[PDB]
Amino acid sequence: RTMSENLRRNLAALEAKISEAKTKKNMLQARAKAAKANAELQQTLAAAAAAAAAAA
Amino acid sequence: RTMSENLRRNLAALEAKISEAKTKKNMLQARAKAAKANAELQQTLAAAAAAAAAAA
Amino acid sequence: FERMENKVLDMEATSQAAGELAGFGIENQFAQLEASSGVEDELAALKAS
Amino acid sequence: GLFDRLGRVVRANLNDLVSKAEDPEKVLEQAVIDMQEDLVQLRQAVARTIAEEKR
Amino acid sequence: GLFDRLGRVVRANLNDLVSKAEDPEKVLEQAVIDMQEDLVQLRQAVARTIAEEKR
Amino acid sequence: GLFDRLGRVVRANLNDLVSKAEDPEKVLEQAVIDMQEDLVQLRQAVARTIAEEKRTEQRLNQDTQEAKKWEDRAKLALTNGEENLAREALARKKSLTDTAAAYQTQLAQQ
């Protein structure tokens, strides 16, 4: 009955950080989608400038 | 008779959120149908502009 | 349920963004004006009768 | 372990492959049907314990 | 880029080659037929949205 | 470098050789066709970013109200003296306020 208190505190301290991780992943997946949308835009703008139809 | 009170509160706290979920799903299914109607419209407008019958 | 709510919100925002942005541009933005038809002068002349 | 890292990679790809098979409009109401009959089963099990605190 | 310049040159020759295949008298009225059935499709899609502003 | 000077000389001759292959009347309108479909591609890419400035605003409004739920639930514990449970609810609140500040920064930039 000293071990069982020690385990019972450790068990609460785990789920307390499953809650923290699960709120962070939402914010990180949001950022990952935004970053990838801007990458495709900047790639498109560069390809258009490489064709230089206005100079032709 | 301590367990039975605890279970009897948990049992009420479940159906209270079945009621909440069932009102939200109606609003979400409405939004899903509207969003999909606009997708088909925007696809149609783009295809028509790609044919450019007025330019021919 | 929570996971499937988020898909609906992604569909909705994708649809609204394209339609809002397609709402710009001279041909549409002038089509919202009542006198855009260009025959206002001969209408005013007809109104002389 | 290295074999855990390869495990989690292959396990995560398969879990995503399922997730994009879920049609929102259908599964968004099967979820409520499941969540309702779960309450029916629970209610029976609870009542089967009250029967013995009486006893 | 040099390969873009060669691309646009060859692409423009092919686009002109098509353009002188168009017979005016025929295509000048297929253009109107296409432009009419486009309105039929559009009208259906619009009506399918009014149905939900009602709803 | 000498090999750069020879490079630029040979590279310039080849670039002129292409330039006199361009027929004005044909290329002068392919140039406009290219310049038009470039706008179609651009418009799609832009719209795909507006879709997410709409979206971070929805997420922000959730977490700024989820935190108030946990702030209330903490006070409801202190009135029962249950400090061990109030501290837990406050820990839930903290991480919500921290991530909400990330959306404000992201949104203002977008």
UniProtKB/Swiss-Prot annotation, chain C:
Query: Where can this protein be found?
Result: Cell inner membrane
**Entire protein: shown range:** 168 to 216 of 267
Q: Which gene encodes it?
A: vipp1
**What name has this protein been given in UniProt?**
Membrane-associated protein Vipp1
Kindly list the organism's lineage.
Answer: Bacteria, Bacillati, Cyanobacteriota, Cyanophyceae, Synechococcales
Task performed by this protein: Required for thylakoid formation.
Similarity section: Belongs to the PspA/Vipp/IM30 family.
Disruption-associated phenotype: Essential, it cannot be completely disrupted. Cells with very low levels of protein have no ordered thylakoids, are barely green and are non-photosynthetic.
Give the highest taxon in the source lineage.
Answer: Bacteria
